[PDB]
Design a protein around this ligand. Structure first.
Ligand SMILES: [Zn+2]
Lengths: 57, 52, 45, 387
RNA sequence: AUGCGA
DNA sequence: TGTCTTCAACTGCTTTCGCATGAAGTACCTCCCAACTACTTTTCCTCACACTTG
């Protein structure tokens, strides 16, 4: 179950973990460049749900 | 570690087999408390042909 | 003699259609196909 | 993987094979030219002759572990090169024969030739009990009609020599016993190998010549010793021949007899097992690290079961994590000197003391019968008193 | 569908 | 009897065009499979007792 969820990033549970989305939590390390590899672990996302918002505030 | 606190927080899940006994008819007398005490994680290993 | 190197012991070997795909010297299950004396032409650019 | 007639044919074949391998080590060990080789061939050619005749679906043949040496024994007797007990002890001690394990062959494949009420039963099933050793030599003679075919069977003035030197090399006892043999021992005539005991009950008629030779040997010592009125053999002399003997190293021989003792049979040598005079202990482990390797080579097992095994041996690795010991006639000489000092109820006891010992020795090389032996003894005892 | 190039 | 008014629920959309590279669900069930060990299987081998003898 944790390989599947960790292989798709569609985390679903009976509480929703109190999180605004049920996908997108996981990303490919995409080692095409050392810059990209180190940059992945210093990247932080405001979350997809705010990506859906039309505003910019 | 955080995971053992989590399993210490999930506590128990109780189920009564409808303890027939023939209070013994609405107090059942059939308690089953299922829980998880510890959670262990082991480093990756592979044994082939199984165990042996 | 065709060759296959064990990915984890370096030991050279020569697999056959009649043996287990495993390093007979270590027991690994991953084998690199060895390079041989085979002609390849190259334009020097 | 073959059952029935053709399964038998290669069980036949394999039997064919190992005997031949047996014979050539025979030549290397004894260097007894075309002669030893060809007589042995036709002997089994003769043996094969009969197997074909009662064929149809006759499966009584598959020879025993012993039939092969009986064959080589019969052929040698023809040639009259040696002896049985000596041959057997030598063979066990040096594994000269491939007799013990049947994996050799050239079979790899004959091995797989499945077993078919056969091939698996071949090569190294068990070690001989009592006559059993001959309980087939006679049968082979039966199959062979060997006595008519081959000259001078069971004979050998060499077994007598082997026997006197065997221990109390009392030079005079050679023709003492040769003389009693001369006497009533088949009307003063060299004992010939018994007949083709055709009957399956294999009665103990004791005609196995040697068995009687050893019997005359023992008797001779007892009688001659019992009545040496002139007192040619001193009271204190008899036990000396005992003290000197009771064990000792062996320029190969005694070490061999230990190796035969270790068939742990009727417990006459079992304890020798226990005792095993220090080094005897050591040269034993030497002969195990050399001739036990003739041991073996699990199959497939992903290399796994095997590798692990290799590692384990990698582990205890070991095998080393006057040339000292002496030859046969050296030991023989030195105990003949250890008795160097030659020139009532007690001596009788000493004599019985000594006879039990030889009974141990001669009996131990052979199928014994801690009484057939003496049954045998009893027999000629009876034979004798018709003067 | 995710990330992404213009 | 006839006509009018507000609110809340429901409908349909709100950048284009392509690479990648497709992968992964899953309870309930399992019969098949691989295993360790023991037990069992087919052919073969070899000795043995009694009655009677003299
Ligand atoms: Zn390896």
């Amino acid at each position: 179950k944790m390989q599947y969820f960790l292989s798709t990033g569609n985390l679903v549970s009976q509480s929703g973990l109190d999180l605004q989305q049920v996908s997108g939590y996981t990303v490919v390390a995409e080692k095409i460049n050392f810059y990209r590899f180190i940059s992945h672990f210093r990247m932080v996302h405001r979350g997809s749900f705010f990506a859906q918002l039309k505003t910019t505030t | 570690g955080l995971l053992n606190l989590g399993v210490k927080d999930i506590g128990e899940k109780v189920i009564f087999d409808g303890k027939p006994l023939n209070s013994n008819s609405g107090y059942l007398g059939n308690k089953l408390s299922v829980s998880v005490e510890q959670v262990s994680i082991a480093k990756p290993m592979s044994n082939d042909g199984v165990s042996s | 003699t065709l060759k296959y190197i064990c990915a984890e012991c370096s030991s050279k070997l020569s697999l056959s259609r009649t043996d287990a795909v495993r390093c007979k010297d270590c027991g690994h299950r991953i084998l690199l196909k060895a390079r041989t004396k085979r002609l390849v032409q190259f334009e020097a650019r | 993987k073959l059952i029935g007639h053709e399964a038998k044919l290669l069980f036949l074949k394999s039997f064919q094979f190992i005997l031949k391998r047996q014979i050539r080590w025979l030549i290397t060990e004894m260097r007894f030219p075309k002669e030893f080789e060809h007589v042995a061939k036709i002997i089994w050619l003769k043996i094969l002759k009969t197997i074909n005749d009662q064929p149809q679906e006759e499966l009584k043949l598959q020879l025993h572990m012993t039939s092969t040496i009986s064959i080589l024994y019969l052929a040698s007797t023809h040639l009259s090169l040696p002896v049985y007990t000596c041959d057997y002890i030598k063979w066990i001690c040096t594994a000269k024969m491939p007799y013990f394990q049947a994996s050799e062959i050239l079979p790899k494949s004959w091995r797989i030739q499945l077993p078919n009420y056969y091939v698996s039963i071949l090569e190294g099933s068990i070690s001989p009990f009592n006559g059993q050793l001959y309980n087939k030599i006679a049968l082979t003679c039966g199959m062979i009609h060997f006595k008519e075919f081959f000259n001078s069977e069971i004979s050998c003035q060499g077994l007598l020599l082997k026997l006197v030197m065997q221990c109390a090399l009392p030079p005079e006892f050679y023709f003492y016993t040769k003389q009693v043999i001369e006497f009533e021992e088949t009307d003063i005539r060299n004992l010939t190998l018994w007949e083709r005991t055709d009957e399956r009950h294999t009665g103990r008629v004791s005609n196995h010549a040697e068995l009687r030779v050893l019997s005359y040997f023992m008797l001779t010592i007892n009688w001659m010793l019992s009545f040496d009125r002139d007192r040619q053999y001193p009271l204190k002399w008899i036990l000396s021949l005992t003290e000197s003997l009771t064990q000792r190293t062996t320029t190969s021989e005694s070490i061999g007899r230990n190796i035969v003792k270790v068939v742990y049979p009727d417990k006459p040598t079992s304890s020798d097992y226990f005792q095993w005079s220090e080094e005897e202990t050591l040269e034993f482990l030497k002969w195990m690290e050399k001739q036990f390797l003739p041991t073996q080579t699990s199959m497939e097992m992903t290399i796994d079961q095997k590798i692990a095994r290799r590692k384990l041996y990698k582990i205890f690795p070991l095998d080393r994590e006057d040339t000292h010991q002496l030859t046969f006639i050296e030991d023989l000489q030195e105990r003949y000197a250890k008795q160097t000092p030659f020139f009532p109820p007690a001596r009788k006891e000493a004599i019985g003391r000594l006879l039990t010992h030889i009974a141990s020795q001669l009996l131990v090389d052979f199928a014994i019968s801690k009484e057939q032996l003496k049954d045998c003894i009893s027999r000629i005892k009876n034979a004798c008193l018709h003067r």
